[PDB]
Design an enzyme around this catalytic site. Sequence first.
Site, PDB file in Angstrom:
ATOM      1  N   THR A   1      23.757  75.121  15.480  1.00 58.66           N
ATOM      2  CA  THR A   1      22.622  74.717  16.327  1.00 58.66           C
ATOM      3  C   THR A   1      21.325  75.214  15.703  1.00 58.66           C
ATOM      4  O   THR A   1      20.476  74.388  15.350  1.00 58.66           O
ATOM      5  CB  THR A   1      22.854  75.277  17.730  1.00 58.66           C
ATOM      6  OG1 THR A   1      23.021  76.690  17.567  1.00 58.66           O
ATOM      7  CG2 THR A   1      24.057  74.640  18.381  1.00 58.66           C
TER       8      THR A   1
ATOM      9  N   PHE B   1      19.554  72.674  25.858  1.00 58.05           N
ATOM     10  CA  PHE B   1      20.384  73.882  26.082  1.00 58.05           C
ATOM     11  C   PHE B   1      21.349  73.663  27.241  1.00 58.05           C
ATOM     12  O   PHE B   1      21.895  74.647  27.768  1.00 58.05           O
ATOM     13  CB  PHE B   1      19.491  75.106  26.279  1.00 58.05           C
ATOM     14  CG  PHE B   1      18.702  75.497  25.050  1.00 58.05           C
ATOM     15  CD1 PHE B   1      19.323  76.082  23.970  1.00 58.05           C
ATOM     16  CD2 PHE B   1      17.340  75.254  24.958  1.00 58.05           C
ATOM     17  CE1 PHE B   1      18.623  76.476  22.848  1.00 58.05           C
ATOM     18  CE2 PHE B   1      16.630  75.594  23.803  1.00 58.05           C
ATOM     19  CZ  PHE B   1      17.270  76.205  22.756  1.00 58.05           C
TER      20      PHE B   1
ATOM     21  N   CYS C   1      23.146  77.143  27.836  1.00 62.51           N
ATOM     22  CA  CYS C   1      23.249  78.038  26.681  1.00 62.51           C
ATOM     23  C   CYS C   1      22.865  79.470  27.043  1.00 62.51           C
ATOM     24  O   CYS C   1      21.692  79.738  27.369  1.00 62.51           O
ATOM     25  CB  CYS C   1      22.317  77.525  25.604  1.00 62.51           C
ATOM     26  SG  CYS C   1      22.433  78.465  24.075  1.00 62.51           S
TER      27      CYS C   1
HETATM   28  C1  HEM Z   1      22.724  82.301  18.201  1.00 60.06           C
HETATM   29  C2  HEM Z   1      22.488  81.148  18.814  1.00 60.06           C
HETATM   30  C3  HEM Z   1      23.271  80.677  19.977  1.00 60.06           C
HETATM   31  C4  HEM Z   1      24.276  81.292  20.687  1.00 60.06           C
HETATM   32  C5  HEM Z   1      24.854  82.677  20.465  1.00 60.06           C
HETATM   33  C6  HEM Z   1      24.700  80.375  21.702  1.00 60.06           C
HETATM   34  C7  HEM Z   1      25.774  80.673  22.569  1.00 60.06           C
HETATM   35  C8  HEM Z   1      26.228  79.786  23.531  1.00 60.06           C
HETATM   36  C9  HEM Z   1      27.203  80.077  24.509  1.00 60.06           C
HETATM   37  C10 HEM Z   1      27.987  81.375  24.578  1.00 60.06           C
HETATM   38  C11 HEM Z   1      27.305  78.998  25.337  1.00 60.06           C
HETATM   39  C12 HEM Z   1      28.202  78.894  26.556  1.00 60.06           C
HETATM   40  C13 HEM Z   1      27.475  79.449  27.826  1.00 60.06           C
HETATM   41  C14 HEM Z   1      28.391  79.412  29.025  1.00 60.06           C
HETATM   42  O1  HEM Z   1      29.002  78.345  29.320  1.00 60.06           O
HETATM   43  O2  HEM Z   1      28.569  80.455  29.714  1.00 60.06           O
HETATM   44  C15 HEM Z   1      26.383  78.019  24.867  1.00 60.06           C
HETATM   45  C16 HEM Z   1      26.219  76.769  25.456  1.00 60.06           C
HETATM   46  C17 HEM Z   1      25.343  75.817  24.930  1.00 60.06           C
HETATM   47  N1  HEM Z   1      24.493  75.967  23.880  1.00 60.06           N
HETATM   48 FE1  HEM Z   1      24.156  77.576  22.828  1.00 60.06          FE
HETATM   49  N2  HEM Z   1      23.989  79.231  21.588  1.00 60.06           N
HETATM   50  C18 HEM Z   1      23.091  79.332  20.590  1.00 60.06           C
HETATM   51  C19 HEM Z   1      22.166  78.395  20.139  1.00 60.06           C
HETATM   52  C20 HEM Z   1      22.067  77.110  20.622  1.00 60.06           C
HETATM   53  C21 HEM Z   1      21.139  76.138  20.208  1.00 60.06           C
HETATM   54  C22 HEM Z   1      20.108  76.343  19.144  1.00 60.06           C
HETATM   55  C23 HEM Z   1      21.368  75.015  20.972  1.00 60.06           C
HETATM   56  C24 HEM Z   1      20.695  73.725  20.971  1.00 60.06           C
HETATM   57  C25 HEM Z   1      19.680  73.515  20.174  1.00 60.06           C
HETATM   58  C26 HEM Z   1      22.455  75.301  21.839  1.00 60.06           C
HETATM   59  C27 HEM Z   1      22.931  74.421  22.790  1.00 60.06           C
HETATM   60  C28 HEM Z   1      23.904  74.765  23.739  1.00 60.06           C
HETATM   61  C29 HEM Z   1      24.371  73.782  24.752  1.00 60.06           C
HETATM   62  C30 HEM Z   1      23.927  72.348  24.832  1.00 60.06           C
HETATM   63  C31 HEM Z   1      25.294  74.436  25.493  1.00 60.06           C
HETATM   64  C32 HEM Z   1      26.080  73.864  26.653  1.00 60.06           C
HETATM   65  C33 HEM Z   1      27.380  73.218  26.169  1.00 60.06           C
HETATM   66  C34 HEM Z   1      28.159  72.478  27.239  1.00 60.06           C
HETATM   67  O3  HEM Z   1      27.673  72.221  28.369  1.00 60.06           O
HETATM   68  O4  HEM Z   1      29.312  72.107  26.910  1.00 60.06           O
HETATM   69  N3  HEM Z   1      22.863  76.585  21.598  1.00 60.06           N
HETATM   70  N4  HEM Z   1      25.701  78.517  23.756  1.00 60.06           N
END
Ligand code: HEM
EC number: 1.14.14.1
Length: 455
Positions: free
Chosen positions: A268, A393, A400
């Site tokens: 991401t 996000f 996220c």
């Molecule tokens: C170090 C960077 C990142 C970490 C550690 C991270 C970690 C996570 C985690 C642990 C979740 C699950 C949250 C939950 O359901 O309790 C999540 C969901 C998500 N993240 Fe991130 N994330 C990061 C960066 C990003 C970036 C840059 C984007 C988009 C540009 C992104 C988009 C998303 C999306 C769309 C979800 C929801 C997925 C779903 O509904 O299936 N993440 N992220």
Amino acid sequence: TIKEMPQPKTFGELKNLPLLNTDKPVQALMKIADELGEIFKFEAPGRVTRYLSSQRLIKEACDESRFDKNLSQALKFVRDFAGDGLFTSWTHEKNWKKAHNILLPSFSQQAMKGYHAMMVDIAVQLVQKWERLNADEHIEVPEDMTRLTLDTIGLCGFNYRFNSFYRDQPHPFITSMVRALDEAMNKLQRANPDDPAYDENKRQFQEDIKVMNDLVDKIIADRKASGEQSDDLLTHMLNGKDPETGEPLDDENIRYQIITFLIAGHETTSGLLSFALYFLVKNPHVLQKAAEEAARVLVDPVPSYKQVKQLKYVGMVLNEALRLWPTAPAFSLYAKEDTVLGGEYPLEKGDELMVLIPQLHRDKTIWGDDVEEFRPERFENPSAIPQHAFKPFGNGQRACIGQQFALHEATLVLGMMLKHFDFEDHTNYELDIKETLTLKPEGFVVKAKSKKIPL
Ligand code: HEM
Ligand SMILES: CCCCCCCN1CCC[C@H]1C(=O)N[C@@H](Cc1ccccc1)C(=O)O
């Protein structure tokens, strides 16, 4: 009244499935959405989902009283190595709420002060790499952004140095993680997966899972033995107790959380920085405005936490890059109960939805006629944006957890890049978006002329 929703072209008994037999299936679905509109049915042998593209419908999909997170088939395949970490757990699994409660304070905006020095360590490695290039050498942008974001979450996640700037070939852990993610996404379009032709794929997949587990389990065991306290998420997870259950995470779940964070850093965040730089070099007036801000704000050799917060226009550049090319391009939902979507589309309990984020972000009813233009100023007055129009996000309690971490790192790094270098799109690069778990601009290269400002 109730409407019949459109459906793309069919392939006899395979229904719509062959539409996704492409290296660019999300881009294919975006073109189908352009043809069919805000909703379409997609059938495959033994399954159906509905792709949503309008703010009108996605605002209703985002109603947590009516819809919860579904594990897409993509996330079910990633779960073979990400386990019941936060990203691949169901909301109703005990380990989801437990890990959520334990980790949320470690991911807050306030928590970013504690990660800032580690982020700066890797950002300075990137700046030094580019300062040390010879005349008319170039930069491989997504390659260097991936070196940076992986190393940043390794150092902030579990005080581990992948040392990606010391390598052509990634750390063995990273080669295994990338090959596991490729196998996961590859299996979405593998017709007869039990064919003996795939015995090698399965062997390699199990080997790659063992490589990831062995490194992460060893680091957890080494930290527990030393009693060492660091500024990393691992320290927070060994120390922390869920206020609800009173339980800490077990060592296996901690390993799944670390693997989950590392997947996230690698895909991401690097994609966001890559797309942001692509849009800046294609929009020189925007590049100049962002560079002027970086020069005005970043007055010290090392950016401070508070200075990163002052890079307001850089934050708008990043939101505009997320608008056009959200690097996690979809999420999945299921209906908790029977319900009618948008007054027109009756759904039964268990019915699935896919949110096509790049399409949502092209809704002209929200953004206006200039929706393909890169205009960060469209984020100047965010109270004017209707609910659930901007979802890079994800949504609600399943949004996220890494959002503040990703935006702090990307704002720091882009700010330093714009302070230290002028950039040239020396190839007149033609955008080519590669699809993995995420989207990134393949083959994007630039030249960077040092402003000769010391660190
Ligand atoms: C170090 C960077 C990142 C970490 C550690 C991270 C970690 C996570 C985690 C642990 C979740 C699950 C949250 C939950 O359901 O309790 C999540 C969901 C998500 N993240 Fe991130 N994330 C990061 C960066 C990003 C970036 C840059 C984007 C988009 C540009 C992104 C988009 C998303 C999306 C769309 C979800 C929801 C997925 C779903 O509904 O299936 N993440 N992220
Ligand atoms: C961070 C983003 C992760 C999820 C992105 C989804 C990325 N898929 C890649 C192909 C298109 C897109 C998607 O709509 N797949 C769905 C539906 C589906 C299930 C089985 C086979 C093919 C498609 C799914 O995985 O259930």
